[PDB]
Amino acid sequence: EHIKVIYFDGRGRAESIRMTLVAAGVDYEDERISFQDWPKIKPTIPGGRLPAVKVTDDHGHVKWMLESLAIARYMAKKHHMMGETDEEYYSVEKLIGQAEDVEHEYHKTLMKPQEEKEKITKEILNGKVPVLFNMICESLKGSTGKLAVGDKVTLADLVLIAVIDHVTDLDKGFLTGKYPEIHKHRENLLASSPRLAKYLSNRPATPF
């Protein structure tokens, strides 16, 4: 396959797909569309929303895939990153759901005036986000190994770090001197996946 991941110039909903490919050691083309260009390109993407993944073989030819975490789960399943037992699969999905709930809170701050955004940010960071972080902590403590689920990288690990990055977008100091399990998880992940370590260190800085 030639794999092309098409998204805006940000982490956003595409980051789980990028990280999955990176962790699995799969080469892909990272196609990033400027907001100025999007209205021109939107008519050409099946469904008209991003991310979309265009997969080209050489036999038939083009296949389009939509729906970010459907794509990520499929790729993760192909590469043995959705758990090794049914119980691990549940644990992966549980942490994904918890992480997605944090993402839902973060999403409230997007496209808001630089005044209301500050109000929403304070509300979610002093309200639901700490509650979800406590659940995430409990989920991590429940692991049988050094990563989110056992000792092998799963999609849960990647979803988790992507959402934590959105939290630190809102408040760079949110985890400073706090949440040792979250820090340890990231350290353990980076030690476990040099491909991901390299990718994260070379990743362009984006606002979302």
Ligand X SMILES: N[C@H](CCC(=O)N[C@@H](CS)C(=O)NCC(=O)O)C(=O)O
Task: Tell me if 103 contacts a second copy by CB under 8 A.
Answer: no
Name the CA dihedral angle for 4, 9, 13, 14, rounded to a multiple of 10 degrees.
Answer: 20
Q: Please identify, using beta-carbon distances, which residue of 89 and 199 lies nearer to a second copy.
A: 89
Per CB under 8 A, contacts with a second copy among 134-193 are: 135, 138
As a whole number of angstroms, the distance between CA 6 and CA 141 comes to 35
Give me the half-sphere count of Cα atoms (radius 13 Å) on the Cβ side of residue 74: 8
Residue 49 or 198: the one with the smaller Cβ distance to a second copy is 49
| Residues in 96-155 at the binding interface with ligand X, rule: CB under 6 A | 97, 101
The sign of the dihedral angle between the CA atoms of 82, 88, 91, 93 is: positive
Give the CA radius of gyration of the chain.
Answer: 17
- Taking residues 50 to 89 in sequence order and writing x for each that binds a second copy by CB under 8 A, - otherwise, the string is ---------------xxxxxxx-xx--xx-------x--x
Say how many residues touch a second copy, by CB under 8 A: 26
Q: At what angle do helices 68-78 and 15-24 cross, to 10 degrees?
A: 10
- Residue 52 among known ligand-binding residues: yes
The alpha carbon torsion through 32, 37, 43, 46 (nearest 10 deg) reads 10
CB of 49 to a second copy, least distance (A): 8
Binding residues vs a second copy (CB under 8 A): 47-49, 65-71, 73-74, 77-78, 86, 89-90, 93-94, 96-98, 104, 131, 135, 138
Annotated binding-site residues read 7-8, 13, 38-42, 50, 52-53, 67-68
